[PDB]
C-alpha cells in the first residue's frame, strides 16, 4: 500500500478514555462488544475514523442510538455528525481459528491468545489503534468452562460468573490507562506455577506463570529470572512493579519472542521453558534476558509509552539497554559486551548498508512490523549506552527520573527522553540527537603520532558516514571515543594536556579534529574505541605486535577480545583472497602463538578465553568485505579452525580435560568453564579425526545436560565426523515429540557443511517434528538455511534462491511477518557478485509478481529492486 511519514504525525481528532470489552469466545466465531467513551478534540466537521481489519460489523450505536451516519472503507469505519462527547458501542465478529498470521486474536494449540503490537487490536474491534490514544480497559471474557477454564486479561480480576450450557465468565480491570497495543486476552487450560515477590516497599505481588499442561517442570527458571528482574530493576533504577499480580503465559505459536502486555505478558514458549537436559546455557541466559526485557518494559514502554510508532526506539533501545545491564550485572559484563558487539558488527552493520537501512527513529514506514529491527533494538540501545557514557551513571539515573516524572502516564517521543537526559545532566545533547535521525554506520579513522622531544601523542581522528539507500545526505555525529594509552610495561599512561587531567572519552564531533596529549612518557600502544563506545567502524593501522601486546596487557577484557578480532580480521581477509585463487590457508606462527598464549595464561578469566577462541561467525566475517564471497568465507573459517586445531592440539586437549565438571549448574563461573571446554572441543573436532570422533561421541553419550550434549552433536555435524548420522538419529529418536529441542536439530541440519544440505532441508519439510504453521519451526529450518548457511544458500546455481521463493510464496499468504523475517537474506543482493545479484533480482521479481503480495514483503522487495 502507501507509506506513512513521521513528519505527518498530528494529534488525534478524537480520544477514547475508557473502553469496556466483552468477548463471547469461540474459535470459529468470536463476538466482540466494545463500549468506548470518546471525546472530540478536532473540528466538528471531522469524522471519527476507526481502524479495523477483517471485522464483520454487526452494529454501531452512539449514546444507545443506532447510528446511520457512517461508512466502511478500505480498513476503516468512518462515523460522522458526532457530539463533542459520547459513548460509542460496536459489536463485531472475528474468526480466531482462521487467523494464521498471529496478528490479533488467534489460536495457539487448544488455547486462544492475542498479539496486538503494533497494529493488531484493530483485528479485534474498530478502534483508534494508535499508541497516543490511551484508555482504561475493562474486559469481560465468556467461554466454555471445559475448553477454556482460565480466562485472562490485563489487570485484576473483578467479577466472575457461571452460565447455563457449560459456560462461564471472568471480568478484568487494569487501572492504568494504556494504548490498545498493550491489550491482551488468553483463554485455555494450563498448568500454573505460582510464587510471590515482595517489593522493596512491602507490596506483595502474585506471580502466575501459565504453561501447556505437563510443562510445569520446565517453569521454575523463568519464574526465578522474573524474580531476579524485579529485584534488579528495584536496585538499579528504583522501579517497583505497580500492580498486585503478574501473569506470564507461554504459547508455542507466536511471531515475536515475547510481549510486554501490562500484567499479562505473552511469551514464545522458546523464552520460558528450560530443563537441564532440554536447554543449553545460552537458552537459560536468553530466558533470563527476555523475561527481564518484558519486565523492564513495565516502566520503559507501559508507564511511559510511544506517541507514535516512529518512536519505537524510545521503548526498545532503552529496554534492550536495560536487559543488557541486567545480564551484565548478574553475569559477566565483558562476555555480555563482547556478544552484543558481535551482534552490532555482524548483523546490524549489514542492515545499515542494506536497502532496508533506516535511522533508529524512522522517517518512513509502510508496514510497521518491518521496523522491529536490529537497528531499532540493538543500535537503539547503543545510542542509549552512548548517553550513559557521556553522562555517567549518577547523571543518567537523574535523567531516567526526570523522564518518568514528566511523562509517567503519557505517550512520549525519542526527543522527549533526550530532553530529560539533557535537562537533568546539563550535558548538551543537541548534536547527539542526530543519532536518532541519521541512518548508516559511521567510519572513524584514526592516525597517530609520537613526538619524543616534547613527549606528546597526537591523535588525528576523522569521521564520515557514507551515503545510504535511504539518505543521500549525511553529517558528522557526536561520537564518544574512549581511549587508553599503554606504555612499554603495560601500565596505563595518564591522559593530560598542560598538567591538567583530560577525560578518556573524547568528543569526536567534527569531520576531522586533533587531540594532543602531554607527559606521554613512552610511545604508546593505544586501545581505541574502548568497550565499543560508539557504533562505528574504526579504521586504524595496527601492527600485529600492537594487537598481541593488547591481548596480553589491556586492563579491560573487552579490549583483549577486540585486539584479537582485529588481529584475526587481517588474516581472514588474506585467506579469503587466497581461497579465491586456489591457495591454501597461510597464517604466521606468531598469530597462532598469541592464541596459544591465551589458552595457557592462568590469569585469564575462562569466559574471556572462550570468546577469544570463538572465531567470528560467517556474518561477522562478511562485514569485513565490500563484496561477499560466502563460499570463500565458509571454507576459510573451516580452514582457519583446522590450522589452529593442529597448531594448538596439545594445549586444546589439556584445557578440554582441565575444565571437566562433574556437577552441572547454571552459575556464571561454571558456564564460563563449560563454554571454554566446548570451545576447545570445537577445534579438537577439526583436528585428528579418530581422536575427534572419540571425544565428540563420548561427550555426547555421556552428557548430563543439553549444553554438552549439543556442543558435541554440533561439532560432529560441523566437522563432518563419522558418528554424525548416528548421534543425529539418536537425538531425533529421543526428542522428536519436543519442538523446542528439535529446533536445535533443524538448525544443525540447515547449517550443515554437507554437500546436499538443500536436498536434506527440502526433505525435512516432511519431518514429523516440522510444521509450516509454527514460526519457531520455520525459523529453525528455513530461516537457518537462508540466514545462517550463506554458503549453501548462495550456491552458484541459484537453487537456494528458488527454494526461498517457494517457501515465501506459501508464507506470504499464511504469515507475512515470518515471510518478512525470511526474505532478509535476499534483499542483501547488492552485496554479492553480479552473477548472484542477477539471480537474486530475478527471485525478488518473481515474488513481486505474487497475486496478493503482502505489504510486509512489498516494502522490502521494492526497496531492494530500486
Task: Tell me the three cell numbers of residue 636.
Answer: 576459510
Q: Which of the listed partners (Zn ion, Na ion, none) does 647 bind, with a CB threshold of 5 to 8 Å by partner kind?
A: none
From residue 133, give the alpha-carbon distance in Å to each of 14, 179, 411, 609.
9, 6, 8, 51
| Active-site residue flag, 638 | no
CB count within 10 Å of CB 84 equals 10
Ligand-binding site membership of 164 (annotated):
no
Q: How far is the CB of 258 from Zn ion (least distance, A)?
A: 8
Q: Considering the complex, state which of residue 264 and residue 680 has its C-beta at the smaller distance from Na ion.
A: 264
The C-alpha cell that represents 302 in the structure block: 507501559
Using the minimum distance from each CB to Zn ion, give the nearer residue, 139 or 319: 319
As a whole number of angstroms, the longest Cα–Cα distance in the chain is 96
Q: How far apart are CA 647 and CA 624, in angstroms?
A: 25
Q: What is the dihedral angle through the alpha carbons of 599, 600, 604, 610, rounded to the nearest 10 degrees?
A: 10
Whichever of 15 and 812 has its CB closer to Na ion, that residue is 15
Alpha-carbon span 842 to 649, nearest angstrom:
47
CB of 613 to Zn ion, least distance (A): 32
258 is in an annotated binding site: yes
Q: How far is the CB of 376 from Zn ion (least distance, A)?
A: 10
Q: Which residue has the cell 610511545?
A: 523
Handedness of CA 591, 594, 600, 606 (dihedral sign): negative
117 is in an annotated binding site: yes
Q: What are phi and psi of 174, to 5 degrees?
A: -110, 115
Interface with Zn ion: number of residues (CB under 5 A): 2
The verdict on whether residue 393 carries a ligand-binding annotation is: no
Q: Using an 8 Å Cβ cutoff, are 387 and 396 in contact?
A: yes
Least Cβ distance, residue 820 to Na ion (angstroms): 31
| 282-321 positions binding Zn ion, by CB under 5 A | 316, 319
Q: Please name which of 595, 675, 597, 677 lies closest in space to residue 641, comparing C-alpha atoms.
A: 595
610 is in an annotated binding site: no
Q: How far is the CB of 815 from Zn ion (least distance, A)?
A: 21
| Kind and range of the H or E run holding 670 | helix 668-686
- Please pick, among 208, 288, 294, 325, the residue that the annotation labels catalytic: 294
CA distance 721 to 716: 5
Peptide bond into 118 cis (omega under 30): yes
316 assigned binding-site residue:
yes
For Zn ion, the closer CB: 319 or 619: 319
Q: Which is nearer to Na ion, 228 or 268 (CB)?
A: 228
Select from Zn ion, Na ion, none the partner in contact with residue 319, using the beta carbon and a kind-dependent cut-off of 5 to 8 Å: Zn ion
What distance in Å separates the CA atoms of residue 483 and residue 797, rounded to the nearest whole number? 48
Closer CB to Na ion, residue 233 or residue 531? Answer: 233
State in angstroms the smallest separation of the CB of 738 from Na ion.
33
230 binds, among Zn ion, Na ion, none (CB under 5 to 8 A by kind): Na ion
Least separation in angstroms between residue 656's CB and Zn ion is 38
Q: Which residue is nearest to Na ion (CB)?
A: 233
Measured from the CB atom, the residue of 240 and 651 that comes closer to Na ion is 240
For residue 837, the cross-strand partners are none
CA 16 to chain centroid = 33
How many CB atoms neighbour CB 374 within 10 A? 19
* Residues, the chain: 866
Contact footprint for Na ion (CB under 5 A): 15, 134, 230, 233-234, 240, 333
Does the annotation flag 268 for ligand binding? no
732 binds, among Zn ion, Na ion, none (CB under 5 to 8 A by kind): none
Write the binding mask 743 to 772 for Zn ion: x where contact by CB under 5 A, - elsewhere: ------------------------------
Nearest CA to 172 among 150, 194, 205?
A: 150
The phi and psi torsions of 297 (rounded to 5 degrees) equal -55, -25
User: Is 812 within any annotated ligand binding site?
Assistant: no
Rounded Cα distance between 146 and 576, Å, is 62
Whether residue 297 is annotated as binding a ligand: the answer is yes
Which residues contribute to the annotated binding site? 117, 257-261, 293, 297, 316
Active site residues: 294
Q: Which residues bind Zn ion (CB under 5 A)?
A: 316, 319
Per the annotation, binding residues for Zn(2+) are: 293, 297, 316
Q: Which residues are annotated as a binding site for substrate?
A: 117, 257-261
Amino acid at each position: 500500500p502507501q507509506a506513512k511519514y513521521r513528519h505527518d504525525y498530528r494529534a488525534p481528532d478524537y480520544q477514547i478514555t475508557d473502553i469496556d470489552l466483552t468477548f463471547d469466545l469461540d474459535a470459529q466465531k468470536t463476538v466482540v462488544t466494545a463500549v468506548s467513551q470518546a471525546v472530540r478534540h478536532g473540528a466538528s466537521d471531522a469524522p471519527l475514523r476507526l481502524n479495523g481489519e477483517d471485522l464483520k460489523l454487526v452494529s454501531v450505536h452512539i449514546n444507545d442510538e443506532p447510528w446511520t451516519a457512517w461508512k466502511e472503507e478500505e480498513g476503516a469505519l468512518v462515523i460522522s455528525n458526532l457530539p463533542e462527547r459520547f459513548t460509542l458501542k460496536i459489536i463485531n465478529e472475528i474468526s480466531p481459528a482462521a487467523n494464521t498470521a498471529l496478528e490479533g486474536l488467534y489460536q495457539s494449540g487448544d488455547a486462544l491468545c492475542t498479539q496486538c503490537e503494533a497494529e493488531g487490536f484493530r483485528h479485534i474491534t474498530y478502534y483508534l489503534d494508535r499508541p497516543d490514544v490511551l484508555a482504561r480497559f475493562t474486559t469481560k471474557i465468556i467461554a466454555d468452562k471445559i475448553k477454556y477454564p482460565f480466562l485472562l486479561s490485563n489487570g485484576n480480576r473483578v467479577a466472575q460468573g457461571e452460565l447455563e450450557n457449560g459456560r462461564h465468565w471472568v471480568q478484568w480491570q487494569d487501572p492504568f490507562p494504556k494504548p490498545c497495543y498493550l491489550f491482551a486476552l488468553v483463554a485455555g487450560d494450563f498448568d500454573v506455577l505460582r510464587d510471590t515477590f515482595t517489593t522493596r516497599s512491602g507490596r506483595e505481588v502474585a506471580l502466575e506463570l501459565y504453561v501447556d499442561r505437563g510443562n510445569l517442570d520446565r517453569a521454575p527458571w523463568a519464574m526465578t529470572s522474573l524474580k531476579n528482574s524485579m529485584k534488579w530493576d528495584e536496585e538499579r533504577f528504583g522501579l517497583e512493579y505497580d500492580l498486585d499480580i503478574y501473569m506470564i503465559v507461554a504459547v508455542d505459536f507466536f511471531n515475536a519472542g515475547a510481549m510486554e502486555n501490562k500484567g499479562l505478558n505473552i511469551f514464545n514458549s522458546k523464552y520460558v521453558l528450560a530443563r537441564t537436559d532440554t536447554a543449553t546455557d545460552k537458552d537459560y541466559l536468553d530466558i533470563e534476558r527476555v523475561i527481564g526485557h518484558e519486565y523492564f518494559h513495565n516502566w520503559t514502554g507501559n508507564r511511559v509509552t510511544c506517541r507514535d510508532w516512529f518512536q519505537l526506539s524510545l521503548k526498545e533501545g532503552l529496554t534492550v539497554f536495560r536487559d543488557q545491564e541486567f545480564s551484565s550485572d548478574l553475569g559477566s559484563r565483558a562476555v555480555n559486551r563482547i556478544n552484543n558487539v558481535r551482534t552490532m558488527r555482524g548483523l546490524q552493520f549489514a542492515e545499515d548498508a542494506s536497502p532496508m537501512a533506516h535511522p533508529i527513529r524512522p522517517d518512513m514506514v509502510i508496514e510497521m512490523n518491518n521496523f522491529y529491527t536490529l537497528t531499532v533494538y540493538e543500535k537503539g540501545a547503543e545510542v542509549i549506552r552512548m548517553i550513559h557514557t557521556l553522562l555517567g551513571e549518577e547523571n543518567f539515573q537523574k535523567g531516567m527520573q526526570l523522564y518518568f516524572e514528566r511523562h509517567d502516564g503519557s505517550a512520549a517521543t525519542c526527543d522527549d527522553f533526550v530532553q530529560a537526559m539533557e535537562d537533568a545532566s546539563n550535558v548538551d545533547l543537541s548534536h547527539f540527537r542526530r543519532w536518532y535521525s541519521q541512518s548508516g554506520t559511521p567510519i572513524v579513522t584514526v592516525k597517530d603520532d609520537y613526538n619524543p622531544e616534547t613527549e606528546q601523542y597526537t591523535l588525528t581522528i576523522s569521521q564520515r558516514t557514507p551515503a545510504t539507500p535511504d539518505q543521500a545526505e549525511k553529517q558528522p555525529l557526536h561520537i564518544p571515543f574512549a581511549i587508553e594509552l599503554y606504555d612499554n610495561e603495560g601500565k596505563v599512561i595518564p591522559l593530560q594536556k598542560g598538567g591538567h587531567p583530560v577525560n578518556s572519552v573524547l568528543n569526536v564531533t567534527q569531520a576531522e579534529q586533533t587531540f594532543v596529549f602531554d607527559n606521554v612518557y613512552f610511545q604508546p600502544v593505544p586501545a581505541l574505541l574502548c568497550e565499543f563506545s560508539a557504533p562505528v567502524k574504526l579504521e586504524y593501522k595496527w601492527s600485529d605486535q600492537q594487537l598481541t601486546f593488547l591481548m596480553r596487557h589491556a586492563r579491560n577484557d573487552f579490549s583483549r577480545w577486540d585486539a584479537a578480532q582485529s588481529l584475526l580480521a587481517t588474516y581472514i581477509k588474506l585467506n579469503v583472497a587466497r581461497h579465491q585463487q586456489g591457495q591454501p590457508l597461510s597464517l604466521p606462527v606468531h598469530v597462532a602463538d598469541a592464541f596459544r598464549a591465551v589458552l595457557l595464561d592462568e590469569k585469564i578469566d575462562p569466559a574471556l578465553a572462550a570468546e577469544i577462541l570463538t572465531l567470528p561467525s560467517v556474518n561477522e566475517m562478511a562485514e569485513l568485505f565490500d563484496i561477499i564471497d560466502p563460499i570463500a568465507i565458509a571454507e576459510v573459517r573451516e580452514a582457519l579452525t583446522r590450522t589452529l586445531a593442529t597448531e594448538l592440539a596439545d594445549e586444546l586437549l589439556a584445557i578440554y580435560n582441565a575444565n571437566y565438571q562433574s556437577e552441572y549448574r547454571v552459575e556464571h563461573e561454571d558456564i564460563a568453564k563449560r563454554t571454554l571446554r566446548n570451545a576447545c572441543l570445537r577445534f579438537l573436532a577439526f583436528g585428528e579425526t579418530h581422536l575427534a570422533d572419540v571425544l565428540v561421541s563420548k561427550q555426547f553419550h555421556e552428557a548430563n545436560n543439553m549444553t554438552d550434549a549439543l556442543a558435541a552433536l554440533s561439532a560432529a555435524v560441523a566437522a563432518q565426523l563419522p558418528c554424525r548420522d548416528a548421534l543425529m538419529q539418536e537425538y531425533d529418536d529421543k526428542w522428536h515429540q519436543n519442538g523446542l529441542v528439535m529446533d536445535k536439530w533443524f538448525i544443525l541440519q540447515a547449517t550443515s557443511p554437507a554437500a546436499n544440505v538443500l536436498e536434506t532441508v527440502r526433505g525435512l519439510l516432511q519431518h514429523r517434528s516440522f510444521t509450516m504453521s509454527n514460526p519457531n519451526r520455520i525459523r529453525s529450518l528455513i530461516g537457518a538455511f537462508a540466514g545462517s548457511n550463506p554458503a549453501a544458500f548462495h550456491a552458484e546455481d541459484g537453487s537456494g534462491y528458488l527454494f526461498l521463493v517457494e517457501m515465501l510464496t506459501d508464507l506470504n499468504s499464511r504469515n507475512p511477518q515470518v515471510a518478512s523475517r525470511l526474505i532478509e537474506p535476499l534483499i542483501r543482493l547488492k552485496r554479492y557478485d553480479a552473477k548472484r545479484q542477477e539471480k537474486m533480482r530475478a527471485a525478488l521479481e518473481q515474488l513481486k509478481g505474487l497475486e496478493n503480495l503482502s505489504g510486509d514483503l512489498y516494502e522490502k522487495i521494492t526497496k531492494a529492486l530500486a
